[PDB]
Enzyme design. Structure first.
Site, PDB file in Angstrom:
ATOM      1  N   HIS B  42       6.172   4.342   2.420  1.00  0.00           N
ATOM      2  CA  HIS B  42       5.474   4.897   1.399  1.00  0.00           C
ATOM      3  C   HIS B  42       4.720   5.273   0.721  1.00  0.00           C
ATOM      4  O   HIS B  42       4.225   4.729  -0.253  1.00  0.00           O
ATOM      5  CB  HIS B  42       6.820   4.435   0.305  1.00  0.00           C
ATOM      6  CG  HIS B  42       6.706   2.710  -0.190  1.00  0.00           C
ATOM      7  ND1 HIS B  42       6.050   2.334  -0.806  1.00  0.00           N
ATOM      8  CD2 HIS B  42       7.301   1.695   0.648  1.00  0.00           C
ATOM      9  CE1 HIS B  42       6.157   1.258  -0.989  1.00  0.00           C
ATOM     10  NE2 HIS B  42       7.050   0.744  -0.384  1.00  0.00           N
ATOM     11  N   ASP B  91      12.041   9.959   2.530  1.00  0.00           N
ATOM     12  CA  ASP B  91      11.109   9.388   0.929  1.00  0.00           C
ATOM     13  C   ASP B  91      12.085   9.666  -0.110  1.00  0.00           C
ATOM     14  O   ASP B  91      11.892   9.133  -0.783  1.00  0.00           O
ATOM     15  CB  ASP B  91      10.036  10.362   0.805  1.00  0.00           C
ATOM     16  CG  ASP B  91      10.410  11.731   0.593  1.00  0.00           C
ATOM     17  OD1 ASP B  91      11.739  11.823   0.656  1.00  0.00           O
ATOM     18  OD2 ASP B  91       9.258  12.669   0.460  1.00  0.00           O
ATOM     19  N   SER B 191       4.975  -3.791  -1.131  1.00  0.00           N
ATOM     20  CA  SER B 191       5.498  -3.024  -0.341  1.00  0.00           C
ATOM     21  C   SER B 191       4.405  -3.205   0.744  1.00  0.00           C
ATOM     22  O   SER B 191       3.063  -3.331   1.034  1.00  0.00           O
ATOM     23  CB  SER B 191       5.198  -1.625  -1.363  1.00  0.00           C
ATOM     24  OG  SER B 191       6.117  -1.717  -1.807  1.00  0.00           O
ATOM     25  N   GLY B 192       4.754  -2.928   2.288  1.00  0.00           N
ATOM     26  CA  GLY B 192       4.743  -2.930   2.413  1.00  0.00           C
ATOM     27  C   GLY B 192       3.868  -4.082   3.593  1.00  0.00           C
ATOM     28  O   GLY B 192       3.665  -4.289   5.310  1.00  0.00           O
TER      29      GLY B 192
HETATM   30  N1  LIG Z   1      13.110  -5.971  -5.358  1.00  0.00           N
HETATM   31  C1  LIG Z   1      12.185  -6.225  -4.035  1.00  0.00           C
HETATM   32  N2  LIG Z   1      12.415  -6.616  -3.425  1.00  0.00           N
HETATM   33  C2  LIG Z   1      10.923  -5.410  -4.152  1.00  0.00           C
HETATM   34  C3  LIG Z   1      10.116  -4.516  -3.146  1.00  0.00           C
HETATM   35  C4  LIG Z   1       8.685  -3.718  -3.080  1.00  0.00           C
HETATM   36  C5  LIG Z   1       8.728  -3.511  -4.312  1.00  0.00           C
HETATM   37  C6  LIG Z   1       9.458  -4.052  -5.361  1.00  0.00           C
HETATM   38  O1  LIG Z   1       9.070  -3.412  -6.678  1.00  0.00           O
HETATM   39  C7  LIG Z   1       9.577  -2.858  -8.009  1.00  0.00           C
HETATM   40  C8  LIG Z   1      10.111  -1.080  -7.534  1.00  0.00           C
HETATM   41  N3  LIG Z   1      12.306  -1.468  -7.645  1.00  0.00           N
HETATM   42  S1  LIG Z   1      11.989  -0.065  -8.382  1.00  0.00           S
HETATM   43  O2  LIG Z   1      13.846  -0.656  -9.041  1.00  0.00           O
HETATM   44  O3  LIG Z   1      11.749   0.213  -9.608  1.00  0.00           O
HETATM   45  C9  LIG Z   1      12.505   1.966  -7.822  1.00  0.00           C
HETATM   46  C10 LIG Z   1      11.020   1.514  -7.380  1.00  0.00           C
HETATM   47  C11 LIG Z   1      11.239   2.852  -7.172  1.00  0.00           C
HETATM   48  C12 LIG Z   1      12.336   3.533  -6.424  1.00  0.00           C
HETATM   49  C13 LIG Z   1      12.526   4.821  -5.342  1.00  0.00           C
HETATM   50  C14 LIG Z   1      13.460   4.830  -4.690  1.00  0.00           C
HETATM   51  C15 LIG Z   1      14.726   4.290  -4.538  1.00  0.00           C
HETATM   52  C16 LIG Z   1      14.241   3.376  -5.252  1.00  0.00           C
HETATM   53  C17 LIG Z   1      13.447   3.285  -5.936  1.00  0.00           C
HETATM   54  C18 LIG Z   1      13.757   2.087  -7.008  1.00  0.00           C
HETATM   55  C19 LIG Z   1       9.975  -0.439  -5.614  1.00  0.00           C
HETATM   56  O4  LIG Z   1      11.411  -0.707  -5.254  1.00  0.00           O
HETATM   57  N4  LIG Z   1       9.329  -0.123  -5.649  1.00  0.00           N
HETATM   58  C20 LIG Z   1       7.898   0.487  -6.187  1.00  0.00           C
HETATM   59  C21 LIG Z   1       7.783   1.125  -6.555  1.00  0.00           C
HETATM   60  C22 LIG Z   1       7.679   2.406  -5.026  1.00  0.00           C
HETATM   61  C23 LIG Z   1       7.213   3.243  -4.888  1.00  0.00           C
HETATM   62  C24 LIG Z   1       5.976   3.828  -5.485  1.00  0.00           C
HETATM   63  N5  LIG Z   1       5.056   3.175  -4.933  1.00  0.00           N
HETATM   64  C25 LIG Z   1       8.397   1.343  -4.054  1.00  0.00           C
HETATM   65  C26 LIG Z   1       9.276   0.682  -3.720  1.00  0.00           C
HETATM   66  C27 LIG Z   1      10.375  -4.404  -5.972  1.00  0.00           C
END
Ligand SMILES: N=C(N)c1cccc(OC[C@H](NS(=O)(=O)c2ccc3ccccc3c2)C(=O)N2CCC(CCN)CC2)c1
Lengths: 4, 241
Positions: B42, B91, B191-192
């Site tokens: 991603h 995705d 992430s990653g």
């Molecule tokens: N909590 C955790 N352990 C964790 C781990 C990693 C990152 C994280 O950050 C917050 C974020 N969480 S969200 O609820 O705002 C959310 C955003 C996009 C999404 C898309 C599809 C489905 C669900 C989604 C949910 C998130 O999951 N991200 C960052 C945004 C990234 C895409 C843009 N680069 C996806 C990963 C939290």
């Protein structure tokens, strides 16, 4: 691998 | 990482920082061999203002501790020559959220730069096991990124519990890791990066790739991670590792  | 602490300098010598040109730190990754990194698919999706899928748009920093000190002794900078995103990466769902990144020139192994061990296909990281998440991501939901690498201790969560907590969203490639009470979790910009699991002789194996969560460190919303054993053969076939 896997140590410091 | 939310609810974590500063890492000691060089404590996670497999943890790498991926910078997109002109943007600073975007994603973590793990060093697995002289030439190869593991990260999340991603992180490498084009959008309308930037070809995040194009290897030439990236710098990997190995042996990094502090984002403001990228030039410190022991820090190695490397470009990427290739990004391979899993072919089954979805995705929408973030199923198969894994990529392999080929370094343009090999890492130099040092006390600060060292590969994590990969688990065999049949290895299972059991429910309840303590494991470590690291990264320079947000230290709160709606927060800012860490300058200094963060570590937090989290726990593998039962798959059925995981699926019930996040209905219709958890595939067998995914693993919940963290706490139902919240408090410690990975977050945006982690992430990653790898999960590091301490194994039977104290060697660290990669137990996951930081993938997504509903926000970060919420109650009943553990971090969702791409499993590693399921891709051991895929890594072998694509990298030689
Ligand atoms: N909590 C955790 N352990 C964790 C781990 C990693 C990152 C994280 O950050 C917050 C974020 N969480 S969200 O609820 O705002 C959310 C955003 C996009 C999404 C898309 C599809 C489905 C669900 C989604 C949910 C998130 O999951 N991200 C960052 C945004 C990234 C895409 C843009 N680069 C996806 C990963 C939290």
């Amino acid at each position: 691998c896997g140590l410091r | 990482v939310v609810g974590g602490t500063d890492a000691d300098e060089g404590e996670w010598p497999w943890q790498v920082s991926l910078h997109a040109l002109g943007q600073g730190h975007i994603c973590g990754a793990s060093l697995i061999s002289p030439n190869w990194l593991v990260s999340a698919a991603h992180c490498y999706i084009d959008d309308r203002g930037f070809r995040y899928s194009d290897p030439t748009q990236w710098t990997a920093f190995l042996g990094l501790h502090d984002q403001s000190q990228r030039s410190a002794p022991g820090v190695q900078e490397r470009r990427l020559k290739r990004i391979i995103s899993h072919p089954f990466f979805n995705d929408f769902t973030f199923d198969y959220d894994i990529a392999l990144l080929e370094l343009e020139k090999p890492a130099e192994y040092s006390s600060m730069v060292r590969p994590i061990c990969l688990p065999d296909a049949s290895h299972v990281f059991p429910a309840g096991k303590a494991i470590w998440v690291t990264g320079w991501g947000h230290t709160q939901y709606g927060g800012t990124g860490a300058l200094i690498l963060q570590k937090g201790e989290i726990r593998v969560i039962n798959q059925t519990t995981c699926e019930n907590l996040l209905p219709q969203q958890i595939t067998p490639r995914m693993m919940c890791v963290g706490f139902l009470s919240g408090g410690v979790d990975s977050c945006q910009g982690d992430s990653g990066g790898p999960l590091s699991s301490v194994e039977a002789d104290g060697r660290i194996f990669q137990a996951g790739v930081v993938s997504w969560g509903d926000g970060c460190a919420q109650r009943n919303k553990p971090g969702v991670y791409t499993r590693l054993p399921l891709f051991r053969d895929w890594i072998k076939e694509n990298t030689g590792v």
